[PDB]
Specification:
This is part of a larger assembly, with eight protein chains of eight kinds.
Chain B (H helix, E strand, L loop, with lengths): L16 H12 L3 E5 L3 E7 L13 E5 L2 E4 L4 H22 L5 H13 L15 E6 L2 E6 L7 E3 L1 E4 L4 H8 L10 H12 L14 E7 L2 E7 L4 H4 L8
Antiparallel strand pairs in B: 1-2, 1-8, 2-9, 3-4, 4-5, 5-6, 6-7, 9-10
Chain F lengths: L17 H11 L4 E5 L4 E6 L16 E2 L4 E6 L2 H22 L5 H17 L9 E7 L4 E6 L5 E3 L2 E4 L3 H9 L8 H15 L9 E7 L2 E4 L2 H8 L4
Antiparallel strand pairs in F: 1-2, 1-8, 2-9, 3-4, 4-5, 5-6, 6-7, 9-10
Chain H lengths: L10 E6 L4 E6 L2 E3 L2 E4 L6 E2 L4 E7 L1 H22 L5 H13 L8 E8 L5 E6 L7 E2 L1 E5 L2 H11 L15 H16 L8 E7 L4 E7 L4
Antiparallel strand pairs in H: 1-2, 1-10, 2-11, 3-4, 5-6, 6-7, 7-8, 8-9, 11-12
The chains are: A mainly alpha, B alpha+beta, C alpha+beta, D mainly alpha, E alpha+beta, F alpha+beta, G alpha+beta, H alpha+beta.
Organism (chain D): Homo sapiens (Human)
Subcellular location (chain D): Cytoplasm; Nucleus
Family (chain D): Belongs to the AAA ATPase family.
C-alpha cells in the first residue's frame, strides 16, 4: 500500500544532515554548513558523513585537535569531485 | 518495463505509453474553460506565477480576428504550433481572400500532429489547445489532445483539476445557449472558482478572459478590464 | 539501459532537459534587479587561481546599448546564443530601423532554445537574465533551459539562488531606487559568496533610461564596497 | 461505494465524479482510495469524509514522483 | 523476449506481434458494420456518448472519400482520417491522370499497399485501424470491401468490425441482401446494432448511418433524418 | 527510408572480425569444388546435386563465364553469388568502354576484392558468404585466383574449396605437378571430386568449365559424360 | 548521414565524453608556458624519443602566425588538424581586417570551434588542450588555455599534461615579480619547473622563447646543459 | 514576344500636414487606348495613421499590397503592437530591393502620421530608395503636379512671400483645383478622385468627380 520514495534532500535536509554528523566532533566554531551544502547538489547522507569523517582526518593529518573550514574544503573536493569517477548514483536515479 | 521506450513500439495490450505520458503534461498545466453562447464564444484562463515578483504566465493567444486559442503544456511547442497556426491562417487569407473555416483548420492541425506520433525517435506534442473560433455557423469550441484526436464541444476544461469545473458545466449547460455576455462570463468564472483552493479565488492578476463576438473581434481581457467582469460575483460558500 | 534523447518521463515531462535544470545549479550566482530608475545587474567570478587573470572571464556581456545579458550554468554554449541575439537585433534594426524590444529578443532566443533532434543534439546548460530599456522603461526577463521565460523584478540565479530569493523578496519593494538596489544587491552577494569581497571577485553593469548600457569596473565599484 | 460503507461519509461525495477522475484503477486501488481518504480525515482530525479527502487519496494511490513542476501553462 | 519489439523482426515461430498488437486495438473501437443491399451499400455506425458536453455531430467515425466512395472506420481516429487523406488524394490522382472515377478493386489495391508499406520497417509503426469501403457503380453494381490493419482486403456481401464482431455478424447472415433494396435494409441494419451494446456497458449511443446506390444516384451521402427516425421507430420492437 | 551508417563488425578484444570469422564457416559449409591450371588453361570443376528428381539441372548453372576468356565458380551460398557475378559482368564493360580491350584477370580481381572489402566495412550490412575461383588465359599464360569474403585473394596452382577442402588440397599436393594438360586436369579433377562426392557421379552431378588460349567455355554433359566415362 | 547525439547529459548533470576526454588530456606530456614582460618562454617536457632516430617530426610547438606560437597536450592526431584550420582562419583574418590576428580572437576561434563540435551529432569531442602564447600589437605578451569543453582562459602562468597539478603547485609557490626581471631568469624558472617535474634525465626538454618581435627560437641542447648547470650550481651553493 | 510589363496609368499625390496627411489618387484603370473601368481607387488604409499610394503595374500593386498586409500582422503577432511609418518605409525599402533583378513596375508614396502627430511623406522609387518629404506626386502627370506645389507649397520663386503654415481647408481646395488642372491635359487622370485624410482621430474619405474623356 504505502510506496515511500527516498530522494535526495533539497538544501535544508542536507544542512540538517551536516548538523547530525557534525555535532559530536571538535570543530572550529565560526564555520558555516550552508556553504558546504551549496557545494553538494546531488549527495546522499552517507557521502555527507564521509565528508565529515574525512574532514576530521585532515585535522589528524598534521597536528590539529579541531578542524577548520578549509579542512572541510579539503574534504569536499576529494570526496565529491575526486571520487567523482564512481559516484554510484546516476544509473540508479533511473534505477537501471 | 520494455514496452515504454519508443512511440513506434506497441504495448501487448496495444496502448502506447508515450502518448499516455504526453497526456500527463496537459494534466500538469493550470486550468482554463472554453464555452460558447448562441452568438459569442468565451474562454477564461487561470494564470500562474512562480515568485510574487515574477509575472503571471499568459495562456490566451489571439490567432486571427475571429480565432483565439488557449494553451496547456510547454510554451515552446505552444509557440511552435502557434506560429504554424497563424501561418495557416494568413496563407489562405492570402490565397482566397476570406477567413479560414475553423473545422477545416483543426483537421489540418491533427494531420500536422499525427506525423511525429508514428515515426522513430519523434515525440508527440504535449499541448491542450482550446480553440474558440467562427465559421459562418457562428461559435465553435474545439479541444485538442496529444493523441491528435480533436473534439468538438460546447463547453470543456483542461489542466490540473478540471473535473469539478466539468461537473459545474454539466448542471448549468442548459443555461448557456440563452444567456448573453455579462452573466455568461461570470458563469465561466463560476466554473473557475470551483477548481481552486478554498481561500484565494480571483485576485485580479491571475485570470484572463477572451471573447469573440458575432459582430465583435476576438479580444483578450487581462486583470484591469477583468475588474468590471470580476466584480458582481458571490462569495464562496463553505 | 540507454533510452532515446526524446523520451518522456513516466511522470510525463522529459529526462534530459530536466537534467539540464540540474546542470545550471552548479554555476556561479547572479542577481539582476529591475528598478524603475534602471536595471542593475551583478555577478561573482568564482576566482580559482592566483596566477589566473581575473578579467578574462566575465558574465556580463551586452547585446545592444540598451540590452545586457547574464549567464549561468555552462559558459561556452552561451556565446552562441549571444551571437544569435546580436545578429537578430541587427536583423530587426536592419529591417525596421528601430530597436527590437527585450521580450521579442527573449522569445526569439527561446524559440531557438528547444530545437535539437536526430535530423537535418542536446539541450543547453545555461541560465539567462536579460536586462534592457525599451519604450516600456526598464525590463528584466529570465529564460529557461526548457525555453520558458518570464519577466522578473529581482531574480537570483545560481547555486545560492533559493537562499538569495528568500533574502531578496523581504528587501525588495516596488518603489526602490538604483543606488540602494546596487548596495542592497551587494549585501546579499556578500552574504552568499565564499571568498572575501573586493573589487575583483565581482563585477556589475547597469542600464538606464537616460544613458546606454554601462558596465562598471574596478574604479567606480569599490565605493559601494567601502560604503556597504 | 461498497468500501465506503462503514465510514462516516458526508453527502458531499459524487461517486460518478470520483470514478471519472479515477481511471485506470482496479478494485485494490479503488479500495485503497477509501482507506487513504479515511486516514487523511484522521490526520486533520475530521470525523466525516469530504470530497477533498478522496481527491487527496487519489494522489497517494497514484504515487507520483514529486519533482518541482509548476512551470507549465 | 525481444522478438516482438520491431516490425522488421520475426518470432522464433515466425510471426510479428506488433501487427497483432495493432489488431488488438481495433476491438476497443466500438462497432462499424456495412452491408450492401441488392442495389446499393448501407453503412452502420453506432456512437457512444462520452459526455453530455460534446456536441451532436462531432468526431464522426464515418467518412466520405469520393462522391461515390465511402469509408467506415474503426481504430485510431487520427490514423483513420490520415488514411482518408491519402485515399482521398489517391482518387484525385486517378481522376487527375486518367479522367474518370476509380474502381474499388484498384482503390483498395492502392490503399492496401499503402497499409502494407508500413509493415516492413522499424522506423514506422503499423496502423491500429480497420475500415470498410463501399460504393455503387452503374457499370459494376455495388461493391463492399474491408481492410484489416495488416493490409489484406476482400469482397463481402456483409461485414462487421468493432468490439462485438462475431456478436454482430452472427445476425447479418439471417438477412437476405441478395434481393432487398436499400429501404428496409436501413431498418434491418438498425435493429442488429440495436440488439448489441447493452445498457450495462454503454450509457447512451447514437445512430450514424451511411447510404449509397442508384437510388442515391450513385452519390454517397448520409441517411435522411425521417428515415432514421423510422429506424428509431423500429428500435423498440426488439424488446419482445 | 535510409540505411544505418554504422559498421556492425568491430574488432574483438582478441582482435578478430567475428562476422568474417563466421562467414568463413559459411563458406566452409559450401559445396565442394576445385580448379587446376595446367600449362595451357584452367579447369574448373564443381559438385552440384539436385535435392530431388523434380529439379531441372539444365535451368541454373554454377560455372559462369564473365567475358570471352574468363570463367568463374564459387563455394558458398546461392543468392550472394549472382549479385557480385552481375557486378563483375558490369566491371568488365567499364574496363572495355575505356580501354577497348578485355580485362586482365588480375585487374578484374583488383576490383572485385575491393568491392568485397568495401562492402564488409560499410554500415548496416552483413558481409558476403562465398569464396570464388577465377580462371583466365590472358597473354598466353593461364591464371588461377581465389578470393574470400574479407576481400583478399591468392594465386593458386591448384586448390580446393567447399567441404573437405582440407583433404582435397592434400590430395592435390600428392597429385599435381607443373607439367600436365587440360584433359589431365579434367581427369584428376574428377579424381578429386570423387573423393568427396556421393555414390553416383553422373553427367549432371558436376559442371566443368575450361579456359584455353581460344578462351573460356563450358562443357556439355555429352563430353562431360565422356569424361566421367573411363574415369577413376 | 550518421546523425546521432553522442554528448548526452547525465542524471546528475555531467558530460561523460567530456570528462573522459579530459582524462586523456591528463595523461599527455607536460608542457609549461610562462610570459615575461618583453619575452615569453614556453616549453614541453618528456620528449621520450628513441634518441637515435628522427626528431623534427615530433615537434609539438608550432606557430599560427609570426606573433602567435602554440603548444598543446593530449593526443597528437586531433591537435594538428585544429592547427591546420587555425592557420586557414588566421590567414583568413588577414583576408579580412589588415592587422595580424590577436591571440584573444584566435582563442575564441578555437574554443568556439570546439564547443559546437561538442554540440553536433556523431562526434566525440576533442581530446586535447592547448597553451596559446601570443605577443600582440603594441607588445602586450599574454597567454591562454583551452579546456576540452572549449573555454578560453587567460593566466599569468599555466601547466597542463600528466603531472600538472603538482607542477602548478610549484608555479604558484615559485612565481614572483622579480623572477620575470631577466628573461633567462624566467628561462631558469621554466627549467626549474621542468626539473621540478618528473625524472627527465637531462635530455628531456624542448624550450622556445620569443622576444615579442622575433620568430620562435629553440636552443640546441647546450644552453639546456648550461642553464641546468648554473641552476644545479645555484641550488648547490644555496644548499 | 511575351512582354511581362505593361503600364496601367494611375496618379497619386500626398502632402504631409502639420497634424494631418493627405493621400489622394484618381480612380481609373486603363491601358492601351481603352478603359477597363472608371472605378479604381488607390487609397489603402494600412493603419489608422498610414495610407499608401501605389502606381504602375496593377498586378504588382495588388501583390505588393497583400504582402504588406501579411507582414503587418506578422509584425504584430511577433511584437504585440503596430508598425510605425518609418518602420513601414524601412521594411518596404528592403522589400523593393528584394527583387532587384526583376523589379516591380510600381511607384509608391507613403502617407501617414508620426509618433508626434505630424505628417510624413515617404516616396519610393521602384528599386527601394527614399527620403522624407513634405509633398510628392506619383504617376503620369506628376511632372505637371510637382512644380505647382513647389510654387504654392514651397513658396519658391516669389518675392516678399510670407510663410503661413498650410491649413487643411487651404489644402483641400488646393487638391480639388490641381486635379482638375491635371485632368485637362492628362489622359490618364481619371473620372473620380479619391481623397483620404489622416488625422489624430482617424481617416476620412471623399470622392470628387472629374471630367470623363
Amino acid at each position: 500500500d504505502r510506496k515511500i520514495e527516498f530522494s535526495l534532500p533539497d538544501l535544508e535536509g542536507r544542512t540538517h544532515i551536516f548538523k547530525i554528523h557534525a555535532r559530536s566532533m571538535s570543530v572550529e566554531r565560526d564555520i558555516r554548513f550552508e556553504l558546504l551544502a551549496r557545494l553538494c547538489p546531488n549527495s546522499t547522507g552517507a557521502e555527507i558523513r564521509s565528508v565529515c569523517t574525512e574532514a576530521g582526518m585532515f585535522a589528524i593529518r598534521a597536528r590539529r585537535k579541531i578542524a577548520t573550514e578549509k579542512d572541510f574544503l579539503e574534504a569536499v573536493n576529494k570526496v565529491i569531485k575526486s571520487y567523482a569517477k564512481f559516484s554510484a548514483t546516476p544509473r540508479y536515479m533511473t534505477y537501471n | 518495463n520494455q514496452y515504454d521506450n519508443d512511440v513506434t513500439v506497441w504495448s501487448p495490450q496495444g496502448r502506447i505509453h508515450q502518448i499516455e505520458y504526453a497526456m500527463e503534461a496537459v494534466k500538469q498545466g493550470s486550468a482554463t474553460v472554453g464555452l460558447k453562447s448562441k452568438t459569442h464564444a468565451v474562454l477564461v484562463a487561470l494564470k500562474r506565477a512562480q515568485s510574487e515578483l515574477a509575472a503571471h504566465q499568459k495562456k490566451i493567444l489571439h490567432v486571427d480576428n475571429h480565432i483565439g486559442i488557449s494553451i496547456a503544456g510547454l510554451t515552446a511547442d505552444a509557440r511552435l504550433l502557434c506560429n504554424f497556426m497563424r501561418q495557416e491562417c494568413l496563407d489562405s487569407r492570402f490565397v482566397f481572400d476570406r477567413p479560414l473555416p475553423v473545422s477545416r483548420l483543426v483537421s489540418l492541425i491533427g494531420s500536422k500532429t499525427q506525423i511525429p506520433t508514428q515515426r522513430y525517435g519523434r515525440r508527440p506534442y504535449g499541448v491542450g489547445l482550446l480553440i474558440a473560433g467562427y465559421d459562418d455557423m457562428g461559435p465553435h469550441i474545439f479541444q485538442t489532445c496529444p493523441s491528435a484526436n480533436y473534439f468538438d464541444c460546447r463547453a470543456m476544461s483542461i489542466g490540473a483539476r478540471s473535473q469539478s469545473a466539468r461537473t459545474y458545466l454539466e448542471r448549468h449547460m442548459s443555461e448557456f445557449m440563452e444567456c448573453n455576455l455579462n452573466e455568461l462570463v461570470k458563469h465561466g468564472l463560476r466554473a473557475l472558482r470551483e477548481t481552486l483552493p478554498a481561500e484565494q479565488d480571483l485576485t485580479t492578476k491571475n485570470v484572463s478572459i477572451g471573447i469573440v463576438g458575432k459582430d465583435l473581434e476576438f479580444t483578450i481581457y487581462d486583470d484591469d478590464d477583468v475588474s468590471p467582469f470580476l466584480e458582481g460575483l458571490e462569495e464562496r460558500p463553505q | 539501459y540507454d533510452r532515446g534523447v526524446n523520451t518522456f518521463s513516466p511522470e510525463g515531462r522529459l529526462f534530459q532537459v530536466e537534467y539540464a535544470i540540474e546542470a545550471i545549479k552548479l554555476g556561479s550566482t547572479a542577481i539582476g534587479i529591475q528598478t524603475s530608475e534602471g536595471v542593475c545587474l551583478a555577478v561573482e567570478k568564482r576566482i580559482t587561481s592566483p596566477l589566473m587573470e581575473p578579467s578574462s572571464i566575465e558574465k556580463i556581456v551586452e547585446i545592444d546599448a540598451h540590452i545586457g545579458c547574464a549567464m549561468s550554468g555552462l559558459i561556452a554554449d552561451a556565446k552562441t546564443l549571444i551571437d544569435k541575439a546580436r545578429v537578430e537585433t541587427q536583423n530587426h534594426w536592419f529591417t525596421y530601423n528601430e530597436t527590437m524590444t527585450v521580450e521579442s529578443v527573449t522569445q526569439a532566443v527561446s524559440n531557438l532554445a528547444l530545437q535539437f533532434g536526430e535530423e537535418d543534439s542536446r539541450p543547453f546548460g545555461v541560465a539567462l537574465l536579460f536586462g534592457g530599456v525599451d519604450e516600456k522603461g526598464p525590463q528584466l526577463f529570465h529564460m529557461d533551459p526548457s525555453g520558458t521565460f518570464v519577466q522578473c523584478d529581482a531574480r537570483a540565479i545560481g547555486s545560492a539562488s533559493e537562499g538569495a530569493q528568500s533574502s531578496l523578496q523581504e528587501v525588495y519593494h516596488k518603489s526602490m531606487t538604483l543606488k540602494e538596489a546596487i548596495k542592497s544587491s551587494l549585501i546579499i552577494l556578500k552574504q552568499v559568496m565564499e571568498e572575501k569581497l573586493n573589487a575583483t571577485n565581482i563585477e556589475l553593469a547597469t542600464v538606464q533610461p537616460g544613458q546606454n548600457f554601462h558596465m562598471f569596473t574596478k574604479e567606480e565599484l569599490e565605493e559601494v564596497i567601502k560604503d556597504i | 461505494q461498497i468500501h465506503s460503507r462503514k465510514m462516516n461519509v458526508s453527502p458531499d461525495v459524487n461517486y460518478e465524479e470520483l470514478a471519472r477522475c479515477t481511471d485506470d484503477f482496479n478494485g485494490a486501488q479503488c479500495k485503497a482510495v477509501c482507506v487513504e481518504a479515511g486516514m487523511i480525515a484522521l490526520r486533520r482530525g475530521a470525523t466525516e469524509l469530504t470530497h477533498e479527502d478522496y481527491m487527496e487519496g487519489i494522489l497517494e494511490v497514484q504515487a507520483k514522483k514529486k519533482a518541482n513542476l509548476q512551470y507549465y501553462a | 523476449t525481444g522478438y516482438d519489439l520491431s516490425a522488421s523482426t520475426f518470432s522464433p515461430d515466425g510471426r510479428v506481434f506488433q501487427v497483432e498488437y495493432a489488431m488488438k486495438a481495433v476491438e476497443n473501437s466500438s462497432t462499424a458494420i456495412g452491408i450492401r443491399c441488392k442495389d446499393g451499400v448501407v453503412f452502420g455506425v453506432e456512437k457512444l456518448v462520452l459526455s453530455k458536453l460534446y456536441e451532436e455531430g462531432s468526431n464522426k467515425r464515418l467518412f466520405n472519400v469520393d462522391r461515390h466512395v465511402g469509408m467506415a472506420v474503426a481504430g485510431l481516429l487520427a490514423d483513420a482520417r490520415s488514411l482518408a487523406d491519402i485515399a482521398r488524394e489517391e482518387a484525385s490522382n486517378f481522376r487527375s491522370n486518367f479522367g474518370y472515377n476509380i474502381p474499388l478493386k484498384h482503390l483498395a489495391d492502392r490503399v492496401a499497399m499503402y497499409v502494407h508499406a508500413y509493415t516492413l520497417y522499424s522506423a514506422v509503426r503499423p496502423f491500429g485501424c480497420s475500415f470498410m469501403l463501399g460504393s455503387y457503380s452503374v457499370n459494376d453494381g455495388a461493391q463492399l470491401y474491408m481492410i484489416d490493419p495488416s493490409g489484406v482486403s476482400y469482397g463481402y456481401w456483409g461485414c462487421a468490425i468493432g468490439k462485438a464482431r462475431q456478436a454482430a455478424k452472427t445476425e447479418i447472415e439471417k438477412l437476405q441482401m441478395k434481393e432487398m433494396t436499400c429501404r428496409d435494409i436501413v431498418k434491418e441494419v438498425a435493429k442488429i446494432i440495436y440488439i448489441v451494446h447493452d445498457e450495462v456497458k454503454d450509457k447512451a449511443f447514437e445512430l450514424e448511418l451511411s447510404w449509397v446506390g442508384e437510388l442515391t444516384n450513385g452519390r454517397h451521402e448520409i441517411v435522411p433524418k425521417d428515415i432514421r427516425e423510422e429506424a428509431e421507430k423500429y428500435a423498440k420492437e426488439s424488446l419482445k | 527510408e535510409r540505411g544505418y551508417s554504422f559498421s556492425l563488425t568491430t574488432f574483438s578484444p582478441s582482435g578478430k572480425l567475428v562476422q568474417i570469422e563466421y562467414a568463413l564457416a559459411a563458406v566452409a559449409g559450401g559445396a565442394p569444388s576445385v580448379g587446376i591450371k595446367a600449362a595451357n588453361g584452367v579447369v574448373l570443376a564443381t559438385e552440384k546435386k539436385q535435392k530431388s528428381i523434380l529439379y531441372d539441372e539444365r535451368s541454373v548453372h554454377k560455372v559462369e563465364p564473365i567475358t570471352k576468356h574468363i570463367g568463374l565458380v564459387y563455394s558458398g551460398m546461392g543468392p550472394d553469388y549472382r549479385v557480385l557475378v552481375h557486378r563483375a559482368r558490369k566491371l568488365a564493360q567499364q574496363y572495355y568502354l575505356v580501354y577497348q580491350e578485355p580485362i586482365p584477370t588480375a585487374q578484374l580481381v583488383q576490383r572485385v576484392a575491393s568491392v568485397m572489402q568495401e562492402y564488409t566495412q560499410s554500415g548496416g550490412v552483413r558481409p558476403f558468404g562465398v569464396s570464388l575461383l577465377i580462371c583466365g588465359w590472358n597473354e598466353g599464360r593461364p591464371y588461377l585466383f581465389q578470393s574470400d569474403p574479407s576481400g583478399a585473394y591468392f594465386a593458386w596452382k591448384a586448390t580446393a574449396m567447399g567441404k573437405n577442402y582440407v583433404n582435397g588440397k592434400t590430395f592435390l599436393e600428392k597429385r599435381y605437378n607443373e607439367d600436365l594438360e587440360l584433359e589431365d586436369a579434367i581427369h584428376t579433377a574428377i579424381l578429386t571430386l570423387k573423393e568427396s562426392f556421393e555414390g553416383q557421379m553422373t553427367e549432371d552431378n558436376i559442371e566443368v568449365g575450361i579456359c584455353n588460349e581460344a578462351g573460356f567455355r563450358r562443357l556439355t554433359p555429352t563430353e562431360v559424360k565422356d569424361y566421367l566415362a573411363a574415369i577413376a | 548521414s550518421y546523425d546521432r547525439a553522442i554528448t548526452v547529459f547525465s542524471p546528475d548533470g555531467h558530460l561523460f565524453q567530456v570528462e573522459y576526454a579530459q582524462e586523456a588530456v591528463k595523461k599527455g606530456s607536460t608542457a609549461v608556458g610562462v610570459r615575461g614582460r618583453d619575452i615569453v618562454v614556453l616549453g614541453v617536457e618528456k620528449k621520450s624519443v628513441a634518441k637515435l632516430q628522427d626528431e623534427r617530426t615530433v615537434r609539438k610547438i608550432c606557430a599560427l602566425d609570426d606573433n602567435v606560437c602554440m603548444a598543446f597536450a593530449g593526443l597528437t592526431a586531433d591537435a594538428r588538424i585544429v592547427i591546420n584550420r587555425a592557420r586557414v582562419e588566421c590567414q583568413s583574418h588577414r583576408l579580412t581586417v589588415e592587422d595580424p590576428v590577436t591571440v584573444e580572437y584566435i582563442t575564441r576561434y578555437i574554443a568556439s570551434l570546439k564547443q559546437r563540435y561538442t554540440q553536433s551529432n556523431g562526434r566525440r569531442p576533442f581530446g586535447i588542450s592547448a597553451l596559446i602564447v601570443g605577443f600582440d600589437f603594441d607588445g602586450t605578451p599574454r597567454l591562454y588555455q583551452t579546456d576540452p569543453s572549449g573555454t578560453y582562459h587567460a593566466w599569468k602562468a599555466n601547466a597542463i599534461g600528466r603531472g600538472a597539478k603538482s607542477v602548478r603547485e610549484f608555479l604558484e609557490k615559485n612565481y614572483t615579480d622579480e623572477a620575470i626581471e631577466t628573461d633567462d631568469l624566467t628561462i631558469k624558472l621554466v627549467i626549474k619547473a621542468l626539473l621540478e617535474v618528473v625524472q627527465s634525465g637531462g635530455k628531456n626538454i624542448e624550450l622556445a622563447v620569443m622576444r615579442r618581435d622575433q620568430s620562435l627560437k629553440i636552443l640546441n641542447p647546450e644552453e639546456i646543459e648550461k642553464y641546468v648547470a648554473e641552476i644545479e650550481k645555484e641550488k648547490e651553493e644555496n644548499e | 514576344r511575351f512582354s511581362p510589363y505593361v503600364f496601367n496609368g494611375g496618379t497619386i499625390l500626398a502632402i504631409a500636414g502639420e497634424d494631418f496627411a493627405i493621400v489622394a489618387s484618381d480612380t481609373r484603370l486603363s491601358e492601351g487606348f481603352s478603359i477597363h473601368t472608371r472605378d479604381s481607387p488607390k487609397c489603402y488604409k494600412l493603419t489608422d495613421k498610414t495610407v499608401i499610394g501605389c502606381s504602375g503595374f496593377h498586378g504588382d500593386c495588388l501583390t505588393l499590397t497583400k504582402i504588406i498586409e501579411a507582414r503587418l500582422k506578422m509584425y504584430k503577432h511577433s511584437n504585440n503592437k503596430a508598425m510605425t511609418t518609418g518602420a513601414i518605409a524601412a521594411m518596404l525599402s528592403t522589400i523593393l530591393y528584394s527583387r532587384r533583378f526583376f523589379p516591380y513596375y510600381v511607384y509608391n508614396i507613403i502617407g501617414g502620421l508620426d509618433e508626434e502627430g505630424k505628417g510624413a511623406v515617404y516616396s519610393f522609387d521602384p528599386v527601394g530608395s527614399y527620403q522624407r518629404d513634405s509633398f510628392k506626386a506619383g504617376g503620369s502627370a506628376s511632372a505637371m503636379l510637382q512644380p505647382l506645389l513647389d510654387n504654392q507649397v514651397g513658396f519658391k520663386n516669389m518675392q516678399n512671400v510670407e510663410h503661413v503654415p498650410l491649413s487643411l481647408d487651404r489644402a483641400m481646395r488646393l487638391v480639388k483645383d490641381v486635379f482638375i488642372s491635371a485632368a485637362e491635359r492628362d489622359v490618364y487622370t481619371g473620372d473620380a478622385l479619391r481623397i483620404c485624410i489622416v488625422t489624430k482621430e482617424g481617416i476620412r474619405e471623399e470622392t470628387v468627380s472629374l471630367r470623363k474623356d
